Design an enzyme around this catalytic site. Structure first.
Site, PDB file in Angstrom:
ATOM      1  N   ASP A 191       4.734   1.774   8.198  1.00 38.57           N
ATOM      2  CA  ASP A 191       4.635   0.331   8.016  1.00 38.57           C
ATOM      3  C   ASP A 191       3.494  -0.242   8.852  1.00 38.57           C
ATOM      4  O   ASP A 191       3.486  -1.425   9.186  1.00 38.57           O
ATOM      5  CB  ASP A 191       5.960  -0.349   8.368  1.00 38.57           C
ATOM      6  CG  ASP A 191       6.419  -0.043   9.781  1.00 38.57           C
ATOM      7  OD1 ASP A 191       5.830   0.854  10.419  1.00 38.57           O
ATOM      8  OD2 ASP A 191       7.377  -0.693  10.253  1.00 38.57           O
ATOM      9  N   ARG A 246      -0.149   9.180   0.975  1.00 33.88           N
ATOM     10  CA  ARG A 246      -0.994   9.166   2.169  1.00 33.88           C
ATOM     11  C   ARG A 246      -0.409   8.280   3.270  1.00 33.88           C
ATOM     12  O   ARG A 246      -0.724   8.455   4.446  1.00 33.88           O
ATOM     13  CB  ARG A 246      -2.410   8.693   1.828  1.00 33.88           C
ATOM     14  CG  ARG A 246      -2.471   7.270   1.317  1.00 33.88           C
ATOM     15  CD  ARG A 246      -3.891   6.814   1.041  1.00 33.88           C
ATOM     16  NE  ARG A 246      -3.889   5.468   0.480  1.00 33.88           N
ATOM     17  CZ  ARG A 246      -3.742   5.204  -0.813  1.00 33.88           C
ATOM     18  NH1 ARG A 246      -3.601   6.197  -1.680  1.00 33.88           N
ATOM     19  NH2 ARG A 246      -3.739   3.949  -1.238  1.00 33.88           N
ATOM     20  N   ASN A 247       0.441   7.331   2.894  1.00 32.73           N
ATOM     21  CA  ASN A 247       1.049   6.438   3.875  1.00 32.73           C
ATOM     22  C   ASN A 247       2.509   6.778   4.147  1.00 32.73           C
ATOM     23  O   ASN A 247       3.257   5.961   4.685  1.00 32.73           O
ATOM     24  CB  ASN A 247       0.918   4.986   3.419  1.00 32.73           C
ATOM     25  CG  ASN A 247      -0.521   4.516   3.409  1.00 32.73           C
ATOM     26  OD1 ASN A 247      -1.348   5.007   4.178  1.00 32.73           O
ATOM     27  ND2 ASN A 247      -0.832   3.565   2.537  1.00 32.73           N
ATOM     28  N   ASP A 270       0.814  -1.218   0.000  1.00 33.12           N
ATOM     29  CA  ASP A 270       0.000   0.000   0.000  1.00 33.12           C
ATOM     30  C   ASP A 270       0.849   1.270   0.000  1.00 33.12           C
ATOM     31  O   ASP A 270       0.625   2.179   0.797  1.00 33.12           O
ATOM     32  CB  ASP A 270      -0.955   0.006   1.204  1.00 33.12           C
ATOM     33  CG  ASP A 270      -2.069   1.045   1.071  1.00 33.12           C
ATOM     34  OD1 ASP A 270      -2.269   1.575  -0.041  1.00 33.12           O
ATOM     35  OD2 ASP A 270      -2.746   1.327   2.082  1.00 33.12           O
TER      36      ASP A 270
HETATM   37  C1  LIG Z   1       1.475   8.520  12.965  1.00 36.29           C
HETATM   38  C2  LIG Z   1       2.134   9.852  13.071  1.00 36.29           C
HETATM   39  C3  LIG Z   1       1.346  10.923  12.770  1.00 36.29           C
HETATM   40  C4  LIG Z   1       2.201  11.980  12.961  1.00 36.29           C
HETATM   41  N1  LIG Z   1       2.095  13.305  12.852  1.00 36.29           N
HETATM   42  C5  LIG Z   1       0.966  13.958  12.568  1.00 36.29           C
HETATM   43  C6  LIG Z   1       0.950  15.307  12.794  1.00 36.29           C
HETATM   44  C7  LIG Z   1      -0.175  16.039  12.502  1.00 36.29           C
HETATM   45  N2  LIG Z   1      -0.276  17.423  12.748  1.00 36.29           N
HETATM   46  C8  LIG Z   1       0.981  18.145  12.558  1.00 36.29           C
HETATM   47  C9  LIG Z   1       0.818  19.496  13.200  1.00 36.29           C
HETATM   48  N3  LIG Z   1      -0.262  20.222  12.514  1.00 36.29           N
HETATM   49  C10 LIG Z   1      -0.532  21.454  13.257  1.00 36.29           C
HETATM   50  C11 LIG Z   1      -1.531  19.487  12.458  1.00 36.29           C
HETATM   51  C12 LIG Z   1      -1.322  18.086  11.954  1.00 36.29           C
HETATM   52  N4  LIG Z   1      -1.215  15.371  12.036  1.00 36.29           N
HETATM   53  C13 LIG Z   1      -1.203  14.075  11.809  1.00 36.29           C
HETATM   54  S1  LIG Z   1      -2.621  13.428  11.192  1.00 36.29           S
HETATM   55  C14 LIG Z   1      -2.154  11.883  10.791  1.00 36.29           C
HETATM   56  C15 LIG Z   1      -2.600  10.760  11.437  1.00 36.29           C
HETATM   57  C16 LIG Z   1      -2.166   9.513  11.040  1.00 36.29           C
HETATM   58  C17 LIG Z   1      -1.292   9.410   9.989  1.00 36.29           C
HETATM   59  N5  LIG Z   1      -0.810   8.257   9.516  1.00 36.29           N
HETATM   60  C18 LIG Z   1      -1.408   7.095   9.614  1.00 36.29           C
HETATM   61  O1  LIG Z   1      -2.467   6.979  10.134  1.00 36.29           O
HETATM   62  C19 LIG Z   1      -0.708   5.887   9.073  1.00 36.29           C
HETATM   63  C20 LIG Z   1      -1.615   5.081   8.160  1.00 36.29           C
HETATM   64  C21 LIG Z   1      -0.599   6.027   7.577  1.00 36.29           C
HETATM   65  C22 LIG Z   1      -0.864  10.538   9.363  1.00 36.29           C
HETATM   66  C23 LIG Z   1      -1.290  11.768   9.751  1.00 36.29           C
HETATM   67  N6  LIG Z   1      -0.113  13.358  12.072  1.00 36.29           N
HETATM   68  N7  LIG Z   1       3.392  11.594  13.341  1.00 36.29           N
HETATM   69  N8  LIG Z   1       3.355  10.225  13.410  1.00 36.29           N
END
Ligand SMILES: Cc1cc(Nc2cc(N3CCN(C)CC3)nc(Sc3ccc(NC(=O)C4CC4)cc3)n2)[nH]n1
Length: 274
Positions: free
Chosen positions: A145, A131-132, A127
């Protein structure tokens, strides 16, 4: 890891069974299960954790620790400041919040390096997409992963009742037709991912085509009567880089470049193309 040592600050994201939270211990990202998670989802979470324990690379998200002693299970990972690659690039414009062409190469090269590592383990991601991927400080890119069914990307998956949810627009033709997932199909997906990056995630792959048309397109690859269609060259993409994308989309799996070659092109050969 002691769950009590974790201080929750913000909920970053969520899926059907899981939630990702920003936590203070030093910031980490913590995936926890929902309170209504099935035992099926718990078992999947455990498997997911066992897989992550193996993958250690600068461009792969790392498993920092776990809390599985009690419900709900917790997984602790790198906190990446800029969230996912898709949302990050979407907020940027190509340099005339801007991003330069050399930086896009650098981003893709890191992804390629991460996939190169997975290839040496004979590990198939299945995948790969922007987005991942995740973005940290200093444009650091790490491939996730683990998975989470975020509603934001529901349109990226083809759903039929009783079937596996499939990212058909990133899948090789032999994947769509046979469910044949290999490293060669990861290369195909990397090509589409590379296309995304150069598009700065402004458009879904084959975005004007329906799912069934995308599936039918995979049939044209099989047939090979010269009726199959490809993703078009992005405005920010030079022809030489695009021909590289095309090699990732070769009909024959053995003709698609290994990630060792892909990484070398993006990190070295293309430095003269700026
Ligand atoms: C897992 C992880 C996620 C993050 N960091 C972040 C950081 C973030 N924020 C960064 C700071 N701004 C102000 C708002 C958004 N928003 C998300 S929103 C988000 C949530 C999940 C995922 N990733 C996943 O769920 C895996 C499936 C790909 C990506 C972004 N993820 N660091 N490590």
């Amino acid at each position: 890891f002691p769950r009590s040592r974790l201080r929750f600050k913000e909920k970053l994201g969520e899926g059907q069974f899981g939630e990702v939270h920003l936590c203070e211990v030093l910031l980490v990202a913590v995936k926890i299960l929902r309170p209504d998670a099935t035992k099926n989802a718990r078992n999947d979470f455990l498997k997911e954790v066992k897989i992550m324990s193996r993958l250690k690379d600068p461009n792969i998200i790392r498993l920092l620790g776990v809390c599985v002693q009690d419900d709900p299970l917790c997984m602790i990972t790198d906190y990446m400041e800029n969230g996912d690659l898709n949302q990050f690039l979407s907020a940027h414009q190509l340099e005339d919040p801007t991003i330069s062409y050399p930086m896009l190469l650098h981003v893709a090269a890191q992804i390629a390096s991460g996939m190169r590592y997975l290839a040496t383990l004979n590990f198939v991601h299945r995948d790969l997409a922007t987005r991942n991927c995740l973005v940290g400080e200093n444009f650091t890119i790490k491939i996730a992963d683990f998975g989470m069914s975020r509603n934001l990307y529901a349109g990226d998956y083809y759903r039929v009742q009783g079937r596996a949810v499939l990212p058909i627009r990133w899948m090789a033709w032999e994947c769509i037709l046979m469910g044949k997932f290999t490293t060669a199909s990861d290369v195909w997906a990397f090509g589409v991912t590379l296309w995304e990056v150069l598009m700065l995630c402004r458009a879904q792959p084959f975005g004007q085509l329906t799912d069934e048309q995308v599936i039918e397109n995979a049939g044209e690859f099989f047939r090979d009567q010269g009726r199959q269609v490809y993703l078009s060259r992005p405005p920010a993409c030079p022809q030489g880089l695009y021909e590289l994308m095309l090699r990732c989309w070769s009909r024959e799996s053995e003709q698609r470049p290994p990630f060792s070659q892909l990484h070398r092109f993006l990190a070295e050969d293309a430095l003269n193309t700026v």
